[PDB]
Structure 1
Amino acid sequence: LHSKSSTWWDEHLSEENLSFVKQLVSDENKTQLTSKLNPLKDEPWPLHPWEPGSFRVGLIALKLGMMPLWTKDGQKHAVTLLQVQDCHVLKYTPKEDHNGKIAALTVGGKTVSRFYKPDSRLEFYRDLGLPPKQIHKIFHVTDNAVIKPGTPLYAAHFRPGQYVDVTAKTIGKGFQMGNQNRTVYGLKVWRVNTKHNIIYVNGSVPGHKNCLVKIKDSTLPAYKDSCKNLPFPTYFPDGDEEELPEDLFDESVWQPSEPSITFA
């Protein structure tokens, strides 16, 4: 019959060839990630100074879970764990071509498999030189803060003591609901784990555990200009001006292994 048939990547792959394919995919992912590790050594776009009214790009992170955190005051604060995975700038949109008010930058994280995706999605990522990402999200970024596509983004962009805004899809409940984007504002950051790129954020984050979320600087009037004392475009590990500690703590936070807090 001259008719369409259903096929999958593993349909005709032999056991010996299938094992080779798995190894090749891992090799390709490793090579692509290493190639993009150094943004500053890949013709970085011009760096502009900070001025009032600048907006930095946001990050996409995975919700690991929640646990209690203690401060030097002896108070216990429940905190949520967010992990930044394979965060990279993908597509830059000019201000005029996207929105006359401000330009936007596309960032994607949480790399995904290439086997069960359309060729169109793979083709776009092949040009970018990076493996496909689970989610594409758009961030409004000022011209001065524009970053070249393919620049790796790390949890060190945010710092302890900075309030941040997280928006995520709510858990779906079925017909009775949910699965709607919501944003939480005014969440302080307690600590950042550089080794695992884990940011500790006060309060709860909508969605289930292991759910991707969008993270951006707090837009509240009180924290109008916090990027002045933070990495203005972003934090670049490639420069390595000073290696950051593996775990970053806020001053009030009580680190473990410290002396027992006495309410003197």
Structure 2
Amino acid sequence: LHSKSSTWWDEHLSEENLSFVKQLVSDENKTQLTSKLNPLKDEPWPLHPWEPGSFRVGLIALKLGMMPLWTKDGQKHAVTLLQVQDCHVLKYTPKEDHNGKIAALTVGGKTVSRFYKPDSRLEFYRDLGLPPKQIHKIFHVTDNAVIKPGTPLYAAHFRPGQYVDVTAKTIGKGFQMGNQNRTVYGLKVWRVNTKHNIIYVNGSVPGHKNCLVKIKDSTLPAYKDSCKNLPFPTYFPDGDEEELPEDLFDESVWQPSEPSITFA
């Protein structure tokens, strides 16, 4: 029949070629990620000093789960685990062209396979030089804090002791429900694991385990300007002004291998 036929990427791939295709895909992912490792060495846009009223960009992270965390006071606090995976800046929108009040930056993480995605999405990412990301989210960022697209974002952008706002889609329960975007406000960060980009956040976060979430600085009036004492645009490992510890702890948090806490 002179009619359309349904095809998949593996339909016409032979076993020998199929194995090669997998190797080629891995090579492309490695090369693209390495090229984007150094943002400051890739003609970075000018970075401006902090002033009151500036807003930093947010990140997208994966919810590993929850585990118990102890403080130096001996109390046990359940903490949720958030992992930042392949977080990169993708598209910058000018202040006028997006919203007269403030500009926005698009950030996507959690790289995904290219086999089962539309060519349009791949075309945009090919220009960006990065592999496709699972989720695209828009973050309001002031002009001074704008960062060139393709800059890798890491969990070190946030720091222990900082309250943060996490919004994620709630678990769907079917006809009975759920599956609605919700935000939890005022969650403190207990610890950050730089090597695996894991942020330890007080309290529970909406959604199932392994569910992508959007993380942005706390918008509560009390924490209006916390970025003054934090990396103002973001944390750049490329700059390497001072290498951060692999695991970042809050002062109250009792690190493992510390002496047993005695209530004296």
TM > 0.5 between the two? yes
CA shift, 1:44, in A, is 0.5
Query: What is aligned with 2:140?
Result: 140
For the aligned residue pairs, the C-alpha RMSD in angstroms reads: 0.4
SS in 1 for 2:91: strand
CA shift, 1:41, in A, is 0.2
CA shift, 1:263, in A, is 0.5
CA shift, 1:150, in A, is 0.2
SS in 2 for 1:228: helix
Counterpart-to-counterpart distance in 2, 1:256 and 1:25: 40
Counterpart-to-counterpart distance in 1, 2:6 and 2:164: 47
CA shift, 1:173, in A, is 0.4
| Gap runs ≥5 in structure 1 | none
SS in 2 for 1:256: coil
Query: What is aligned with 2:119?
Result: 119
SS in 1 for 2:73: coil
Counterpart-to-counterpart distance in 2, 1:259 and 1:224: 37
Summarize deviations over 1:137-194 as a string: whole Å, max 9, x none.
Answer: 0000001000000000000000000000000000000011111100000000000000
Query: What is aligned with 2:220?
Result: 220
CA shift, 1:93, in A, is 0.3
1:99-110 matched pairs, under 5 angstroms: 99-110=99-110
- Percent sequence identity over matched residues? 100
| Gap runs ≥5 in structure 2 | none
CA shift, 1:55, in A, is 0.3
TM-score after normalising by structure 2: 1.00
Summarize deviations over 1:180-224 as a string: whole Å, max 9, x none.
Answer: 100000000000000100000000000000000000000001111
TM-score after normalising by structure 1: 1.00
Counterpart-to-counterpart distance in 2, 1:72 and 1:247: 17
SS in 1 for 2:120: helix
Counterpart-to-counterpart distance in 2, 1:141 and 1:175: 39
Aligned length: 264
Counterpart-to-counterpart distance in 1, 2:105 and 2:231: 17
CA shift, 1:111, in A, is 0.2
Counterpart-to-counterpart distance in 1, 2:259 and 2:246: 21
SS in 1 for 2:16: helix
SS in 2 for 1:257: coil
Summarize deviations over 1:89-138 as a string: whole Å, max 9, x none.
Answer: 00000000000111000000000000001111100101100000000000
CA shift, 1:252, in A, is 0.3
